[PDB]
Design a protein around this ligand. Structure first.
Ligand SMILES: C[C@]12CC[C@H](O)CC1=CC[C@@H]1[C@@H]2CC[C@]2(C)C(=O)CC[C@@H]12
Length: 284
């Protein structure tokens, strides 16, 4: 209980999670063929993808993403609140999960449910998590940038190692009910990425309906919505509410790694990811 819940070799947050729900998640939760699920390692762009999916279902009309909080419109199945709400929700259901493949519901692998897996450059994921997690109460905090940098590459951080999460899920990449996307293609060509998603899910949008979704799904529009940027967390769970909105700390890895840290991280990545095709990863 040393500042985190330990379960099957993986660390989880202290507030909002319990050992028994995590066990029922694997052994008993029932997945349906009509469910749609967003899968990500934390801080890889979950909130932006969730906003786009709500907008496609509502044909571009936006008071929903402007009225309801992301954890209500796309709940995390492994948390208490999420598990409760989902277990009593009428199809179709839209939800999210950060779990690695060994802890995901057994029921899924016997289904036809559609999943979308989103990955991001791990240098930006490391920076974004450093600033976000060190600002949350009741969570084990690092004593310095250098110390967090070492935790991340050894794997002793929330939800485990980024290298193990990616290796576990990649073998599902050519299955019919699985779509692989990168944060980089989403930001460089949002419109082309929205079309890949509409084809995979198999729905049809009218011309004026696609125009509205395109208007409400821009990067800029995304960062300023209070329903999606986490700035609705109460003063009871945050250390300093004022820097929740700080800038230059949710990516921009070059402004934070020293030259020696970047050369050493390049060698580590090549070593660990050598058994997969290099061109699957669109970043230097
Ligand atoms: C919502 C969020 C933050 C965003 C993540 O994608 C999902 C998540 C899991 C546990 C939450 C955390 C916010 C901060 C919380 C509330 C803590 O301080 C402990 C539990 C933490």
């Amino acid at each position: 209980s040393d500042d985190f819940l330990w379960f099957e070799g993986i660390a989880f947050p202290t507030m909002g999670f319990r050992s028994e729900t995590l066990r029922k998640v694997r052994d008993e939760f029932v997945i349906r063929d009509e469910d749609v699920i967003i899968l990500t390692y934390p801080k890889s762009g979950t909130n932006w993808l969730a906003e786009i999916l709500c907008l496609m279902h509502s044909k571009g009309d936006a008071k929903w993403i402007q009225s309801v909080p992301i954890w209500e419109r796309s709940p995390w199945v492994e948390s208490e609140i999420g598990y409760t709400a989902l277990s009593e929700t009428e199809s179709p259901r839209l939800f999210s999960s950060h779990l690695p493949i060994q802890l995901f519901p057994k029921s899924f692998f016997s289904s036809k449910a559609k999943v979308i897996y989103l990955m991001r450059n791990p240098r930006d994921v490391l920076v974004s998590g450093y600033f976000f997690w060190k600002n949350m109460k009741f969570l084990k905090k690092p004593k310095s940038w250098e110390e967090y940098f070492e935790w991340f590459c050894q794997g002793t951080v929330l939800y485990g190692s980024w290298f193990d999460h990616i290796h576990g899920w990649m073998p599902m990449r050519e299955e019919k009910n699985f779509l692989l996307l990168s944060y980089e293609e989403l930001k460089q060509d949002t419109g082309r990425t929205i079309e890949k998603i509409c084809q995979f899910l198999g729905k049809t949008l009218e011309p004026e309906e696609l125009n509205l979704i395109l208007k409400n799904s821009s990067f800029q529009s995304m960062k300023e919505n209070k329903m999606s940027n986490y700035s609705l967390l109460s003063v009871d769970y945050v250390v300093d509410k004022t820097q929740l909105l700080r800038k230059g700390v949710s990516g921009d890895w070059k402004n934070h790694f020293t030259v020696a840290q970047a050369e050493d991280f390049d060698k580590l990545f090549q070593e660990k990811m050598a058994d997969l095709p290099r061109e699957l990863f669109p970043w230097e």
